[PDB]
Design a protein around this ligand. Structure first.
Ligand code: SRM
Ligand code: SRM
Ligand code: SRM
Ligand code: SRM
Ligand code: SF4
Ligand code: SF4
Ligand code: SF4
Ligand code: SF4
Ligand code: SF4
Ligand code: SF4
Ligand code: SF4
Ligand code: SF4
Lengths: 417, 363, 363, 417
């Protein structure tokens, strides 16, 4: 075999990424011999080869990239160059094009085929369904093909635009939300779409200190992992009683251990069951879902719905990994979402003014204080923002809180206040 | 005319199944029928079957087409992916569900599974979220696709059935950038370096902007060297994070003998039961041993088996440690605690520990 | 010849009661009799009654001679103070327990209390551990002995009886130096300034070590002037800790009008039932009002009384909070939550939150 | 009234400090007219007057002090001056002398009557019983009286030496322990005195980057607040089974609600009670003490006894308030405590050589890492030092844990090893 190490990973029950690469080379190469117009017939076969050499070396053979893009945009394409390009010229340039996915990754077969027709003409044939931000990954093409590839995408019966990369608003994503799910507290797919469209300029033309990501989750289970992988996590919640079908409960009681599997596991004792009737104190509840999760035919999120905004989620660099924290306890989520847009635009203005090179929004707030962040978004301090008050007394006071004094007087006559 | 730009993705409502578009936002309940199969019942009476299959995330365009022929046959031309890169089909005729599962299994070799059921308390292991590795990335410590495949091979039986007592997510990052919710997984595989950079002065002078390269080091280990207009590294402060190489081609730190993976555990995203949590390191290092990474795979299976044998229903890994304490954790997993596992990452502030990183709060 | 030095304190073992002396390290059981009285039974069998009174901490040498006289009559020539500055008496004559009490308040005017019975779960409130204030200390924002006078006064009947549901400690500090058990008490009063320092250039040149004064400021607000040679201060960066004034006499920050106490809550030293906790601000500032500090006394007592009123047997203030959460703590105490209470002290490392600051762990 | 504001504070039920200051002056001035050798009768009156101005002004009237001390010692006396030194002549100098307490603050009546006579002679007559660290506080004397005072103190029938101040070892202190407490896991009083004696030179002659405190608790009730108020807190514990008298527990259960006050309140549910028998799972117990506190007639500490050492407790400055963390999970406590002394001396040697000006030990460990601290005291890392393993993958590795490689050879070749 040409690939003895990777051939090992065609064995075994789990579907093999190696067979996908080989299937692409076989069938791309076979498309080209038949005189179909395919620009990169050897690319998936150079990728395999380079990858086998990487397996033997236990190291990457990709080197830092030049900047590359389509006409009129500043991000969406990651330039990638092989260090093996003379030995394997078909992968000398092998850039990725991120293609913005439909909200919650819903497709019709007509939409997928146009994508497959476009990528087969201009690229390697390899794709990721999906990149971790959410985009479709068009993996591997040359610089000269990026522009005509994008022109074909925009001209398709069902057209697709480029997603984000670099110091921009990244491609927003959303959980399935109300398309499939009975726990959804707002229209996740509609909001995602609307944000994508409102801020096309922000996404396509990086202008900011660094990247900014938004993800929308329908409910607190967070099935898009927003609090950890977006700076601005929008997470469905509710303000009023959990809705209880009491008949449906007894149907559950006839077989489920409700005491142990439900009652006992509520974080706050919110929910007592006495053999004939189920009670929720909703004032104790914290909407952690679990009981709803446990009894979906009987229990439902309350009627007065909205979102909680958690701020600052990010991977570690530089100042450490972040699960985002409470910025806005409750905001309403209805089209055209002006309250959310208002909050976003304020954050962006402040961040573009005060942020350092490569400073994330979470880091800027750690540096400036939540007091300044809250003044920026026009909201007040709220106990739900913290998990405990401060364990030290080194507090800053606003000038206007201090008593008028001889000392406040000397501070002005010394020009320091 | 000019070329079209700024038009965004296709509007999703036009790519929804008519029965999905009709009942949008008007569901009664969902019921997990068997591994891979979720029945969804609308207010109107409509019943739809969501059938879920695992994929290698990296798909041939020829594979996506075949998935297209299948969705035309069984789901009226409609399909979706989940936020773990499963793929999902919608079947209105319950009689054709097993026909579908058997046709995908045959034509593309994807397996039906990846679901869990909180109602009964029985959980499958779903797909592993992961990155490019050696396939595309310039900064990896480990491969992602090779390792996911090696691990999924060993734990296959947990994807096609509901045999675990709680959710368990497994995620992989090929370097300390993460590129996923890998820092908040029940088990996380994270690529590391264990060697400092060797500054290459010619490359630094040519291509690196010095002040931002220096500001990217979390420990202050880098200083400008004005004399030779380069950067000097103090090795006693370096912990091989790699962030200086992301910024600067002249700071490589890769060593194929000493690059490898840390195994972290105990992250949680969801709020149910217990607040969300960052994962924690329990195995400092395992080497890269392509194509099958036996050492890394063995430790992953060892941690999974130990939790699954002692976990009560609904008690995920961090919840299990919540109950037993870390002393028992290390004992029952047969893992060693060493000084490496003692946090020394200084730059992160204590006050973050006091911010509510959770949607759990009372009105 | 020269003084005898390096001789240390007098051997404790020689300053002991005969009954304490014999039975040393060998008791069967203790047993709170009423408030203030403590029975101890030895393996031997001999009985002791340890009797406890309020001391104003600060004493006259004459209130000590008098203490001695009492003590020769009742406690064979022996006595002791405790870790909160009460004074314990050693009758073994079990009828002279209650002529004493009288003859101890008749004389010096100390009241018997400061006790608690975890066994029956009834509790008194002991002494406030405080510092020096305007009496001797040269950096106080508040006056220890004075506010402690007031506060005790207004709460005197918690001292003299077993009126509370669990243990509560009150403690004080004159400035952010936080002398004593103020960083970890159930209720804590801490002097703060709210004004930055105006530099006295005349007094910095002649006195201060500029490089060290500068390097003493936690937020790095101070920067060496080289003119001129003095210190300047970025007011935007100053949180009025008063540390620069400890280093250097030319940095007063005192403003009689804006200095005050902050009130913190929910610290714990013992391990019983739940792990140690550092105290937390709930009130940013209350004014100095000598002689009576009515604003200070009002808030303090309002806080405890809302915790008396709601607490369960053994449920400490931190433990009540663990049960109701911070959202209800603020409602029941009537306090508001403002931005001052969100932590912004940058310097403390997050990794401290992951160290075991407690003696609770499994073998 | 000479003092309108301070007089308010002689009213009330709580014992008045203002009374105590008046009681002193009256009597010292009474003695001085009678010809008793009272060098400072005016002192207490000075203090009162100074204090009244302070109460009116709401600010201190003490200024920064030049350094002062006895001969042969570098610490023990706090130099204090008044800014009313001309208006009030008798408080221009008003220094405190810290006077080492016997272990556990145990006194005989002679021991006390001696201190009383020396201080009436040379000082204001005002004291503190006791200071926070534990020393007896002689409040307000003059520069010249310091030395004669010290000579007389030592020349007492029962003699007292000066305690600690400055950058030294401070006066160690200890709970009552086995003098009174049936919970004592080791003899706190002996250890305290032995420690005070062994390191007399370190206490009297400050040589270190800053202060260092030791406090000794008999058991984990931490009755001297050692984990918060000392850098090195030696807290009692035990390795074997809590001892349990069954019949004493039935005496308890006829009147005590053991289920709700003991069983339910256990941090790890190690304790159980079915009505005829109590059972303790010592593998589960974290020796938090609660049950023992609740049932002193029935439950005791186990028989394999020693202590746990918590390191680094301190007030805020500079890097934050600290409750000490696990340094040594178990150490034996028996005379002459050479295993403990071994630790202490290893810590100091390192701290004196590495520490910065005014750097506490907990802050040195924060700066240098627990690994280095551990190597110094010759101990292994142990899971019991953390509440959780680290949340990030940014681990340091020793050179010798690395696999030899072309890369490590390159490192060696360049002198980066
Ligand atoms: C389809 C997908 C959303 C999407 O747009 O794709 C999804 C769909 C549902 N999720 Fe989810 N979740 C999905 C991602 C997640 C993720 C995000 C991730 O893992 O990266 C999590 C957070 C992971 C974590 O918490 O650390 C997530 C945490 C949950 C929770 C919490 C589990 C808990 O015990 O803590 C529920 C509750 C449950 O088990 O019913 C849940 C429940 C559900 C329910 C049952 C909702 C409903 O009422 O229909 C859906 C069926 C899931 C099933 O298999 O039982 N979903 N869910 C996601 C499928 C992933 C997959 O292929 O496995
Ligand atoms: C007299 C004194 C010892 C000494 O050497 O000076 C002392 C003596 C006892 N303490 Fe204590 N504690 C003494 C300081 C403390 C303090 C430290 C402080 O506040 O300065 C607390 C730690 C505070 C904290 O945790 O924040 C303390 C934490 C305890 C615990 C805690 C109860 C809890 O639920 O947390 C026990 C339990 C009990 O029996 O209530 C305790 C119990 C005891 C016992 C019952 C021990 C015994 O077996 O006899 C002693 C009887 C006192 C009583 O009232 O019940 N002692 N004890 C202490 C002097 C203080 C005073 O005058 O009131
Ligand atoms: C450009 C670079 C490599 C580098 O170190 O300079 C990169 C940078 C980075 C780096 C470093 C940087 O930004 O310079 C980090 C660290 C940022 C930080 O503040 O710590 C990073 C955090 C993520 C994170 C965590 C959230 C966050 O941003 O922190 C996510 C998760 C998310 O977006 O949902 C993420 C999602 C991808 N990240 Fe990422 N990521 C790269 C790939 C990816 C994608 C393509 C990997 C994948 O397999 O899916 C993921 C996005 C494709 C998509 O459009 O959907 C990537 C190059 C791949 C290539 O050349 O082919 N990266 N990527
Ligand atoms: C030297 C100075 C202030 C100065 O700059 O002149 C000082 C320094 C300080 C300063 C330190 C400094 O300025 O060097 C602070 C900041 C400590 C820190 O590192 O954050 C401080 C933490 C304490 C602490 C916290 C424990 C700790 O830090 O581990 C304690 C508690 C303890 O030791 O149990 C404490 C116990 C006293 N501290 Fe303190 N302390 C002073 C008073 C006291 C005493 C004497 C007041 C009192 O009687 O309550 C306390 C002890 C009497 C005794 O010797 O027994 C004090 C002046 C003596 C005076 O009254 O003129 N100080 N004092
Ligand atoms: S985040 Fe909530 S609403 Fe969304 S798919 Fe998950 S459970 Fe459904
Ligand atoms: S959502 Fe959580 S806190 Fe609310 S009652 Fe249900 S299970 Fe409990
Ligand atoms: S985790 Fe690291 S190696 Fe993997 S894609 Fe992201 S940046 Fe590249
Ligand atoms: S590898 Fe990380 S710690 Fe080391 S010099 Fe580079 S940025 Fe700094
Ligand atoms: S807390 Fe401050 S003002 Fe009070 S005695 Fe201590 S150092 Fe002095
Ligand atoms: S008062 Fe504190 S924060 Fe302000 S300048 Fe002085 S040392 Fe710095
Ligand atoms: S620490 Fe323990 S041994 Fe010492 S007095 Fe307190 S309860 Fe007794
Ligand atoms: S000492 Fe504490 S952990 Fe141990 S059995 Fe008793 S109550 Fe439980």
């Amino acid at each position: 075999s040409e690939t003895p190490l990777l051939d090992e990973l065609e064995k075994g029950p789990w579907p093999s990424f190696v067979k996908e690469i080989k299937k692409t080379a076989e069938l791309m190469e076979k498309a080209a011999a038949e005189g179909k117009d395919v620009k990169m017939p050897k690319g998936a076969r150079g990728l395999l080869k380079q990858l086998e050499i990487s397996y033997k070396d236990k190291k990457t053979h990709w080197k830092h990239g030049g900047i590359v893009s389509v006409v009129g945009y500043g991000g969406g394409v990651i330039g990638r160059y092989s260090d093996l390009g003379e030995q394997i010229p078909e992968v000398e340039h092998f850039h990725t094009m991120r293609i913005n996915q439909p909200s919650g990754w819903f497709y019709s077969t007509k939409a997928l085929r146009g994508l497959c027709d476009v990528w087969e003409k201009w690229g390697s044939g390899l794709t990721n369904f999906h990149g971790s931000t959410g985009d479709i990954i068009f993996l591997g093409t040359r610089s000269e093909y990026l522009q005509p590839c994008f022109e074909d995408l925009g001209n398709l019966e069902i057209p697709f635009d480029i997603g984000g990369s670099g110091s921009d608003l990244r491609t927003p994503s959303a959980c399935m939300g109300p398309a499939l799910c009975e726990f959804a507290c707002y229209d996740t797919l509609e909001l995602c779409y609307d944000l994508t469209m409102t801020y096309q300029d922000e996404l396509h033309r990086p202008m900011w200190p660094y990247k900014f990501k938004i993800k929308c989750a329908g409910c607190p289970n967070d099935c898009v992992a927003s609090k950890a992988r977006s700076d601005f996590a929008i997470i469905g919640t509710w303000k009023d009683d959990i809705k209880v079908d009491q008949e449906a409960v007894k149907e559950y009681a006839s077989w489920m251990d409700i005491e142990n599997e439900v009652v006992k596991l509520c974080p706050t004792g919110a929910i007592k069951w006495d053999g004939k009737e189920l009670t929720i104190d909703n004032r104790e509840c914290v909407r952690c879902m679990h009981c709803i999760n446990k009894m979906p035919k009987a229990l439902k999120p309350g009627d007065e719905r909205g979102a909680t905004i958690l701020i600052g989620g990010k991977a570690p660099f530089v100042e450490g990994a972040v699960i985002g924290w409470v910025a806005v306890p409750f905001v309403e989520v209805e089209k055209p979402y002006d309250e959310i847009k208002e909050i976003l635009e304020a954050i962006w203005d402040w961040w573009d003014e005060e942020g350092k090179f490569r400073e994330r929004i979470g880091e800027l707030i750690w540096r400036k204080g939540m007091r300044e962040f809250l003044k920026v978004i026009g909201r007040e301090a709220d106990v739900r923002m913290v998990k405990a008050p401060r364990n030290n007394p080194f507090m800053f006071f606003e000038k206007d809180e201090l008593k008028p004094s001889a000392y406040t007087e000397e501070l002005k006559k010394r020009g320091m206040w | 005319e000019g070329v079209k730009t700024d038009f965004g993705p296709p509007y999703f409502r036009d790519l929804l199944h008519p029965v999905i578009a009709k009942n949008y936002g008007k569901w009664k309940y969902h019921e997990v029928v068997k591994p891979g199969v979720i029945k969804r019942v609308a207010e109107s009476g409509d019943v739809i079957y969501v059938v879920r299959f695992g994929t290698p995330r990296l798909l041939s365009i020829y594979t996506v087409r075949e998935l297209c022929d299948i969705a035309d046959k069984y789901s009226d031309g409609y399909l979706r992916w989940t936020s773990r890169n499963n793929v999902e089909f919608f079947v209105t005729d319950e009689s054709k569900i097993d026909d579908l599962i058997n046709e995908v299994q045959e034509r593309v070799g994807f397996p039906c599974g990846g679901t869990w059921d909180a109602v009964k308390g029985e959980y499958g292991l779903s797909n592993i979220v992961h990155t490019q590795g050696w396939i595309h990335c310039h900064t990896p410590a480990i491969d992602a696709s090779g390792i996911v495949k090696a691990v999924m091979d060993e734990l296959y039986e947990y994807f096609t059935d509901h045999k675990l007592p709680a959710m368990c997510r497994i995620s992989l990052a090929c370097c300390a950038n993460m590129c996923g919710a890998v820092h908040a997984s029940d088990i996380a595989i994270v690529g590391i370096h264990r060697t400092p950079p060797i500054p290459n002065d010619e490359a630094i002078r040519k291509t690196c902007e010095i002040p931002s390269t220096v500001a990217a080091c979390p420990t202050g280990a880098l200083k400008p060297d004005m004399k030779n207009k380069t950067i000097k590294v103090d090795v006693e402060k370096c912990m091989y994070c790699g962030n200086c190489y992301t910024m600067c081609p002249g700071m490589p730190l890769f060593d194929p003998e000493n690059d490898g993976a840390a195994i972290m555990v105990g992250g949680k995203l969801s709020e149910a039961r217990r607040m969300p949590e960052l994962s924690k390191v329990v195995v400092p290092w395992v080497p890269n041993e392509p194509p099958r990474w036996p050492t890394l795979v063995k430790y992953v299976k060892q941690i999974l088996e130990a939790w699954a044998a002692n976990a009560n229903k609904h008690e995920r890994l961090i919840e299990w440690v919540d109950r037993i304490g870390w002393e028992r954790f290390f004992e029952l997993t047969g893992l060693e605690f060493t000084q490496h596992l003692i946090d020394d990452y200084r730059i992160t502030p204590y006050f973050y520990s006091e911010f509510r990183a959770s949607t759990q709060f009372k009105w």
